[PDB]
A paper describes a structure:
MRG1 and MRG2 belong to the MRG protein family, with highly conserved members in fungi, plants, and animals. Members in this group have the same domain organization, with a chromodomain (chromatin organization modifier domain) near the N-terminus, and a MRG domain near the C-terminus. Firstly, via their chromodomain, MRG1/2 proteins act as readers that recognize methylated H3K4 and H3K36. In addition, MRG1/2 proteins bind to chromatin that contains tri-methylated H3K4 and H3K36 via their chromodomains, the bound MRG1/2 in turn stabilize the binding of CO and ultimately controls the activation of FT transcription.
H3K4me3 (residues 1–9) and H3K36me3 (residues 31–41) exhibited detectable binding to MRG2 chromodomain (residues 41–123) (Kd values: 0.8 mM for H3K4me3; 0.69 mM for H3K36me3). To obtain the information regarding the specific MRG2 residues that are important for recognition of the histone marks H3K4me3 and H3K36me3, we determined the co-crystal structure of MRG2 and the methylated H3 peptides. The proteolyzed samples were analyzed using mass spectrometry (MS) analysis to determine the protein sequence, resulting in the identification of a region containing the chromodomain with residues 53–123 of MRG2 as suitable for crystallization. MRG2 complexes with the H3K4me3 and H3K36me3 peptides were obtained, but the complexes with the H3K27me3 and H3K9me3 peptides could not form crystals under the same conditions, consistent with the ITC results. The crystals of MRG2 with H3K4me3 or H3K36me3 were diffracted to 1.68 and 1.65 Å, respectively. In both structures, the MRG2 chromodomain contains mainly four beta-strands. However, the predicted alpha-helix located at the C-terminus is missing in the electron density map. The tri-methylated lysine projects into the aromatic cage formed by the His62, Tyr67, Tyr87, Trp90, and Trp94 residues of the MRG2 chromodomain. The co-crystal structures clearly indicate that the chromodomain of MRG2 can directly bind to tri-methylated H3K4 and H3K36, and provide strong evidence that the aromatic cage of the MRG2 chromodomain and the associated residues are essential for the binding, the same as other chromodomain proteins. Consistent with the structure, the Tyr87Ala (Y87A) mutation in MRG2 disrupted its association with H3K4me3 and H3K36me3 peptides, supporting the idea that the hydrophobic pocket formed by the aromatic residues is essential for the binding, as with other chromodomain proteins.
Numbering used by the authors: 51 to 107
Amino acid sequence: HFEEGERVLAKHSDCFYEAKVLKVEFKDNEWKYFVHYIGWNKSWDEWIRLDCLLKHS
């Protein structure tokens, strides 16, 4: 699990991008994370699932 404001790696297409978690939600027995991709337009902000997130380090 991840927290609001946490720096994470987020998978988009084929690879992982530096990202920040903006919002956390739980619905239909699953966690979703609204992320912002660091150094990218706000327009790319999106909801992603747990299996597309990676902790740093």
